[PDB]
Amino acid sequence: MNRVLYPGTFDPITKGHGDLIERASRLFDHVIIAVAASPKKNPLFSLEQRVALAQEVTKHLPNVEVVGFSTLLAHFVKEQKANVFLRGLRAVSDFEYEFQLANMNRQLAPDVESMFLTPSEKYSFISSTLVREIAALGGDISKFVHPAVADALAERFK
Amino acid sequence: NRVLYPGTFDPITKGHGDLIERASRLFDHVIIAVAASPKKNPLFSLEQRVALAQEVTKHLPNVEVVGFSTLLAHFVKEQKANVFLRGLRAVSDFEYEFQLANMNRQLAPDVESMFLTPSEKYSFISSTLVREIAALGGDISKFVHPAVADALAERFK
Amino acid sequence: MNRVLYPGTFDPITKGHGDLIERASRLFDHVIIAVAASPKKNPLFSLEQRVALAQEVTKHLPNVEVVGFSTLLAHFVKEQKANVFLRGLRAVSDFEYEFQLANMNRQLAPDVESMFLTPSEKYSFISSTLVREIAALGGDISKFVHPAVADALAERFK
Ligand SMILES: CC(C)(COP(=O)(O)OP(=O)(O)OC[C@H]1O[C@@H](n2cnc3c(N)ncnc32)[C@H](O)[C@@H]1OP(=O)(O)O)[C@@H](O)C(=O)NCCC(=O)NCCS
Ligand SMILES: CC(C)(COP(=O)(O)OP(=O)(O)OC[C@H]1O[C@@H](n2cnc3c(N)ncnc32)[C@H](O)[C@@H]1OP(=O)(O)O)[C@@H](O)C(=O)NCCC(=O)NCCS
Ligand SMILES: CC(C)(COP(=O)(O)OP(=O)(O)OC[C@H]1O[C@@H](n2cnc3c(N)ncnc32)[C@H](O)[C@@H]1OP(=O)(O)O)[C@@H](O)C(=O)NCCC(=O)NCCS
Ligand SMILES: [Ca+2]
């Protein structure tokens, strides 16, 4: 009955995200990974590449699917008919941001719940941004991302 | 006591508005100092941000609005204000405000820095989130004054 | 045989940085100030200028030297044969970011320690960004930076 939507830029999706998704898949009947077009960031990967990578990482989860969107989250969730937003908390500064996003979404989409998970301690500290920067300088990122994602970063950077 | 409330106000929100109301009832003279903040790349021009702030505060006889592009520590002296007002709603706001205040204390030692918190009803409102939501056609009329809402509507088309 | 590497953008180096360097100098045999290119922050000063300013500020310390680098920190520190990273802490948001940086470097360079110092309270409130913005507006920053840095910032904005 619960359809949960996990929105993010996922540039690229990391094991941090992956941990939260494994856990959300075992908790909800239907999990939608919502990859946001985020042009105000100049994402390393195109929307289509980021959707593809997230699918690759979650294809073994039958109740998890991936979609891209460029519209307002509060609008888009209505198109997906999800009644729950999922957001991750890894740092105390995440909570502040998520707190204001949640209360703001509460005004725009009053019938959608905002819930949070924190990733396991092994998969905390993983920044999508730091993964990009490390990969860009030829550092090994295989401990932070799925092999398919690792392969994509390598190819992306020559 | 002449209080100066500096900010980008891009645009001014109900959070700012709450604090201004409260400061109006507390001080003889309240100056809203709208900073040209070129590095934030403001959605609204300085002139637009000043006009909106004026519109939102025109019912308050002891509150006036000025734009400035100069150093705050210099500008507050030109305005002859002896108090800075800044809002606090999140702890990351506090650290930044703490650091700005101790540095202004070095640049303007005779000026006091004080803080207010908006009511919980406006506590969660970010000017940034208001811009982004409006940019995507989300309704932001509950986060801002009617004149600001119109301005946001016209701003994107 | 402790060699400490202090990485940062230093755009420009401040009294905040200098305090940590003074202290690390009395604590370690060899102190390396690693100035990062950081092209993505679009630094006000070029890498060479930033190295030069750092050199000027630290020339009275016999066991301290300054180098520029554009490579992965985790690679560069091994290249320097340093066994310790030094990072400064002034606010809790720094701690969050540094905590996460330390844990990802620990994966990339497991034999390198991450240690932290906090500056004396007189220099704890000093931000290089704020120094830049104040100077760009013709404000006096001489109590926040060494004279050579003050002079360089003035020339930079005219
Ligand atoms: C939630 C949402 C609104 C904001 O996007 P976001 O949360 O900042 O992006 P993410 O969900 O991937 O999480 C933050 C990520 O962006 C990166 N990031 C953090 N701060 C950043 C900054 N100033 N600039 C660019 N990127 C940043 C980080 O790397 C972080 O990823 P990481 O934690 O894995 O390192 C977006 O997911 C969304 O759904 N947009 C739809 C638009 C909408 O409905 N409203 C606009 C305001 S709600
Ligand atoms: C102090 C000052 C630089 C910061 O701008 P500010 O608006 O007062 O501080 P902020 O309010 O931006 O801090 C966070 C808030 O702004 C938003 N915000 C902060 N940084 C932002 C950024 N880069 N981009 C977009 N939005 C931002 C957030 O939404 C948040 O909420 P709010 O806008 O509703 O108030 C500006 O007010 C000022 O007074 N400048 C004078 C310049 C000067 O004399 N010296 C420069 C160094 S002192
Ligand atoms: C990781 C790193 C960014 C940390 O160093 P650092 O934080 O920049 O060190 P500094 O004290 O000189 O600079 C800090 C300032 O940069 C600011 N800053 C951080 N990210 C920024 C960004 N994208 N854009 C602009 N300013 C930024 C911070 O707000 C901070 O401001 P403040 O100190 O005035 O308050 C980098 O400098 C480093 O030490 N090693 C990088 C190695 C690597 O991974 N790649 C190197 C290739 S260049
Ligand atoms: Ca600094």
The 10 Å Cβ neighbour count of residue B32 is 27
Q: Is some CB atom of chain B closer than 8 A to the CB atom of A136?
A: no
User: Residue for token digits 């940034």?
Assistant: B128
Q: How many residues does chain B have?
A: 157
A41, B83, C17, C79 from C82: Cα distances, Å: 35, 49, 19, 8
Question: Which helix (H) or strand (E) is B30 found in, with range?
Answer: strand B29-35
Closest CA to B1 of B65, B63, B74, B83: B83
Q: Tokens 């606090």 belong to which residue?
A: B88
Q: Extract the tokens encoding A78.
A: 């209505």
Residue C30: give its domain's CATH number: 3.40.50.620
Ligand 1 interacting residues, C-beta cut-off 6 A: A 7-9, 14, 36, 41, 72-74, 101, 127-129; B 129, 132-133, 136
Tokens of A42: 């100049």
Query: Obtained via which technique?
Result: X-ray
Using DSSP, state whether B82 is helix, strand or coil. Answer: coil
- Burial class from Cβ neighbours inside 10 Å (0-12, 13-18, 19+) for residue B29 reads middle
Q: Give the DSSP H/E element, type plus range, for residue A8.
A: strand A3-8
Look-up of token digits 């982004």: B132
Number of independent structural domains in chain A: 1
Other residues' Cβ atoms within 10 Å of the Cβ of residue B39: 11
Q: What tokens appear for A66 in the block?
A: 């991936």
Instruction: For residue B9, give the ligand 2 atom closest to its CA.
Output: 7
Radius of gyration of chain C (CA): 15
Identify all chain C residues contacting B71, using CB atoms and an 8 Å cutoff.
134, 137-139
Give the resolution in Å: 2.2
d(CA B106, CA B100): 10
Q: How far is CA C19 from CA C35, C57, C58, C122, in A?
A: 16, 11, 10, 10
| CA C83 to mean position of chain CA atoms | 17
Q: Which domain holds residue A61?
A: 1-158
Q: What is the 3-state secondary structure (H, E, C) of chain B?
A: CEEEEEECCCCCCHHHHHHHHHHHCCCCEEEEEEECCHHHCCCCCHHHHHHHHHHHHCCCCCEEEEEECCCHHHHHHHCCCCEEEEECCCHHHHHHHHHHHHHHHHHCCCCEEEEECCCHHHHCCCHHHHHHHHHCCCCCCCCCCHHHHHHHHHHHC
CA distance A131 to A14: 8
Within 8 A by CB and 6+ apart from B68, the residues are B33, B34, B35, B36, B75
Asked whether A63 and A28 are in contact (CB, 8 A), the reply is yes
C-alpha to C-alpha distances, C112 to A46, A117, A125, C4, C108, nearest whole angstrom: 36, 31, 18, 10, 9
